[PDB]
Ligand binder design. Sequence first.
Ligand code: 402
Ligand code: 402
Ligand code: SF4
Ligand code: SF4
Ligand code: SF4
Ligand code: SF4
Ligand code: SF4
Ligand code: SF4
Ligand SMILES: [Cl-]
Ligand SMILES: [Cl-]
Ligand SMILES: [Cl-]
Ligand SMILES: [Cl-]
Ligand SMILES: [Cl-]
Ligand SMILES: [Cl-]
Ligand SMILES: [Cl-]
Ligand SMILES: [Cl-]
Ligand SMILES: [Cl-]
Ligand SMILES: [Cl-]
Ligand SMILES: [Zn+2]
Ligand SMILES: [Zn+2]
Lengths: 621, 618
Amino acid sequence: ALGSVFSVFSEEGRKIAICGKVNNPGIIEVPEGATLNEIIQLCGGLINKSNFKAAQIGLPFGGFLTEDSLDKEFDFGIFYENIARTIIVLSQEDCIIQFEKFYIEYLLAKIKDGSYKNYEVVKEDITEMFNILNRISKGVSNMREIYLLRNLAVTVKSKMNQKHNIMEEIIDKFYEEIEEHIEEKKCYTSQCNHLVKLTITKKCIGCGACKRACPVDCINGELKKKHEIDYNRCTHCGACVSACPVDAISAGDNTMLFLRDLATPNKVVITQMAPAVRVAIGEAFGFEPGENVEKKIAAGLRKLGVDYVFDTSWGADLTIMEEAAELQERLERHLAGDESVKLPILTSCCPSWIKFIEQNYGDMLDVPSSAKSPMEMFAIVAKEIWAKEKGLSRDEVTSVAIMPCIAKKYEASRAEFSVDMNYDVDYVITTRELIKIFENSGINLKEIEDEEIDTVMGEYTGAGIIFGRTGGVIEAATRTALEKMTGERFDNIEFEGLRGWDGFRVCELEAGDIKLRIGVAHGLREAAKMLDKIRSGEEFFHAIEIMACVGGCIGGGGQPKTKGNKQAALQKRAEGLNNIDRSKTLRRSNENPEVLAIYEKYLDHPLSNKAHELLHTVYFP
Amino acid sequence: LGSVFSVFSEEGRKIAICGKVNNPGIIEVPEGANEIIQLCGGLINKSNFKAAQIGLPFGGFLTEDSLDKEFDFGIFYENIARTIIVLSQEDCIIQFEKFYIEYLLAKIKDGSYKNYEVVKEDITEMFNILNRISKGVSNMREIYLLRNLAVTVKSKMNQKHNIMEEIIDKFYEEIEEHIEEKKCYTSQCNHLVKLTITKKCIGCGACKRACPVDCINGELKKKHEIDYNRCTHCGACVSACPVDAISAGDNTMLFLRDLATPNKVVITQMAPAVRVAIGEAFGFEPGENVEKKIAAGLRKLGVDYVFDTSWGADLTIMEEAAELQERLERHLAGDESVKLPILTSCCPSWIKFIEQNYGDMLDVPSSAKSPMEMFAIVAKEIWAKEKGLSRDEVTSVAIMPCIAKKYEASRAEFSVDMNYDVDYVITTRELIKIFENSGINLKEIEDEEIDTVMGEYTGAGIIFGRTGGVIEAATRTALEKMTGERFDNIEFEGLRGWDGFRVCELEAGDIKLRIGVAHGLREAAKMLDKIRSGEEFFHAIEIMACVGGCIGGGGQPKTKGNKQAALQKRAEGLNNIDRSKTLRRSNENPEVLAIYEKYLDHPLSNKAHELLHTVYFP
Ligand code: 402
Ligand code: 402
Ligand code: SF4
Ligand code: SF4
Ligand code: SF4
Ligand code: SF4
Ligand code: SF4
Ligand code: SF4
Ligand SMILES: [Cl-]
Ligand SMILES: [Cl-]
Ligand SMILES: [Cl-]
Ligand SMILES: [Cl-]
Ligand SMILES: [Cl-]
Ligand SMILES: [Cl-]
Ligand SMILES: [Cl-]
Ligand SMILES: [Cl-]
Ligand SMILES: [Cl-]
Ligand SMILES: [Cl-]
Ligand SMILES: [Zn+2]
Ligand SMILES: [Zn+2]
């Protein structure tokens, strides 16, 4: 396979394969008398105009060139016996630590499969090198690591009887960057997703759209003065990023890491995708909003190198099991006169409300459900159950989430969703990022064959799929809970009261002896209105749903920019999800056989101790 | 093997009780029909029964259900092992299960029970999980994992009651507490313990008056609380409390358990000031150096290697004198980017003292680590490597005179992959009680030598323990190297003395340096205020939180007779150790020089910064 480019392209004598940070990666015929720089120019320079940093020769083994070799004739002697003649070019926009992690993991794979048994003796040593790099990338290291790396490098150079080990020169030439990463916990290229915080960059022109758009008044700054984010109050709703006319606000971009992981041999890569992605991505390829192209996305992902493709709506069904259980418990306790219970119960997978409450509604910390999000539920099940059944350690599986927003990036970055430095969601990719991957890689969703999603964690019901538009989470929870409480199967499962588009909606649901009052908000200002009304006693609710983005996750800032009327397109996506729900035979989360298998085999019933241990978390510790 | 609070090391129809029983030991047990403990003298304090392990390698686990009911004699499993570990409500279950797992793993690894080989990694993983809980880096999911691991083992061991399952079932509350609330209600998990005022507080206000930084809020008799964000861990509040209301943990039991773990390498370092005060508990006068007595006692306890912190102090002097020479050369060269004075002190208490009140002086202190952390990092990254041991196969224990060193060793900057360079700290009083209850009398035991590679030290290093010693040693080395002249008289009496704030005026060749010394954080505040106002200029300063320096630490034995006289006796004792040494400059120590020649290659090198330097005020 092999390949790399910022706009992303996995490209599957006197001929070389250039795949670095150059524009137009490809196979090139080198003129006789040519420098490195001239080869770069024949490929069109480096993405943007970031200057040359280094060039790796041979992916398993070769040389490592820096500026000192840029204007010198490219001696082919560096292509020693059976090197395959490959060059990875680096610009100043690439982090050395991530690249060296990729190099070490590649070498380790080729050792482990027996292609390079002569290097077996150093396996353990090299593994430690990776671990050291990993500790640096996660920000859990001291400067001592450098010392260790050096000795390890020296160790390798002793056992391989080699005159030049790569890591020694790497340390010598980029000590400044390494020290920056370690002491300042900063990656100046923003490739280390665990060291990146949502920040306004130096490019900012002091316009102001972000200062107006923030619903919590989190941004300070006036006139052309650079604006700053009070990160201790940021909800990661992404309004500022979407409203910025420029690249002034950065929250990272995990595309290159995805490509490198896909290009690592014998590395298991699995993906989940949010309900709302499948009704919007196709817009970039000639489909209308609302058209479900999940099979096209599955085919494209598998073409890219994904070994297993799963679905977040399975996790949404599991979330519904847990949340309907908790809601019924709370209602039963309330009807019994239990004042220890707290109402309403908040059901929402949106992270944005967490801080939104912590910073303005400390009297309602007992309201939201303890259940994790569908994304993290999927991740924990994939790594702690699915992988275990297949005999894989959690670090032997790379779980990638395809989601419509940056708040999911922040969620996947939370340490609560990790163990032994392994994050349940390894990293998050936005809809736009995947669109650009497909576009630059030649994947056209309009013309690719359909492929099925994998079964164990891909099958989902309509209740789960409606999660992606406002009112879906509470609608699914209500379906299951009311059917559970009344014993009655509803002829019409759609609750039109919970649907609609008003920022703040009130509904009244009647079923047998059971009567519930529901409040729904999309847009954090409407949410503030609703919560102020609840606190003042102006309105009483049994349950509420809060979404930060208008229309729900189908309206996330990571989705493709709408064409035509924005509101019309968002409504089209929502009705597309509703039509997916209507096309499914099963339309209650509790009918999904695979979630029930999860309960029958491991957790034994919803809200059990095991279910709490795995699928629940502590918001507001 | 042995274990009990207040310490003990106890090195057919026969039983060996060694848990939380008062008066541990073997016991001819009668065959008559809860009061079993009473025949052994009850439990330490009056703490209620929690559980009892039968057989140390493997056996049964008894809980309260057998307490007031017929305790069947024969139920002692055929592999009873004739040993019993009884647990009280004062013991953390997580630490006990860690000790059990490590004992089992060691006895597997030495071949004593090959039949358990199949479960090794499994059991090992359990330990790791427990460790993550004890270090506070876990979610509730760990419980899930543990359960399944247990289920696996019980299948292969075909056991009717697996120990981990019963642990989860009966002590779920404690595990959930540890994980979600990051709280060990027995305070055995040293990494979850913070300096706190307990419920025994009555509201004296002694703590509020004694604190030099006004870190305690509260009025009347209302319970007082510590604002941890400003605490210097000087320990004045602990000493001043009329009760035991303020607790900062006690790693005695962990030390005993590690010593009782087979094939576990335990090494120790000791602060300079310990050796002139500990002997007071055994009839020695203040100032008498009993370092050999301490070494012999530690070896009797089971310690495999005994080292000295003064070696690390010599290394620290090397680095700090290098930095001072660099800074003075730059200042004399007209470099205004440089910062003076330079602060030389291994006391952590000034860190928070400056960051919260002197943010204009963050570039003053040297980037050099403390001697304790330098010793720890060298022991684990070089010494252990030389002897072919991973850092987790070595347990480094620091014997220090204060609580601030516990908090320092607990800092994440001095750790890697959850392994802390200083695994835990033992105070002088704690070691005194260990010796007292184990029958070790330092005035009545043979002398033993300290281990060499990291134990030999100079007088410059040893004077660290009393006020003015750190700066005196740094000045000795730096001036001797800067002038090329070896001083006939190496003692700088101006830096000695007992005043809270001392000023010195040092001349050597063309060099004239102005020095400021403070012991007591209020006197230090006076000095730093004077520096800020420009009333006085200093080239270097030394700050000690405790009066007299570390010899006056809150972890030292309470003085007998006149306090000031005793502290002066200890300080002059350290000075007399210095006077008895052939080498009295840190740069003469062959082992530190070997460290430089073989690994770091010169002071202030890149490797020296990587290992022996840290970033205060990140
Ligand atoms: N986690 C989760 Fe959600 C689920 O299911 C997604 O995945 Fe959303 C979508 N689509 C996103 O992003 S988050 C907020 N709740 C509504 S939907
Ligand atoms: N670290 C260190 Fe120090 C050294 O050397 C000790 O060990 Fe002190 C002593 N004695 C203690 O406690 S800390 C403060 N500096 C003066 S001395
Ligand atoms: S929008 Fe982009 S540019 Fe305009 S202010 Fe906010 S950040 Fe600066
Ligand atoms: S993200 Fe939402 S909240 Fe955080 S700053 Fe940008 S707008 Fe304000
Ligand atoms: S609503 Fe907008 S922000 Fe909240 S989760 Fe769905 S997408 Fe992310
Ligand atoms: S006991 Fe110690 S803490 Fe409690 S009040 Fe008196 S002084 Fe303050
Ligand atoms: S420790 Fe020192 S500083 Fe912290 S509270 Fe007690 S006295 Fe005040
Ligand atoms: S002076 Fe020595 S003992 Fe007293 S606190 Fe500072 S360091 Fe600990
Ligand atoms: Cl290598
Ligand atoms: Cl972010
Ligand atoms: Cl692959
Ligand atoms: Cl499965
Ligand atoms: Cl299918
Ligand atoms: Cl959009
Ligand atoms: Cl031992
Ligand atoms: Cl000796
Ligand atoms: Cl004292
Ligand atoms: Cl060297
Ligand atoms: Zn980086
Ligand atoms: Zn504990």
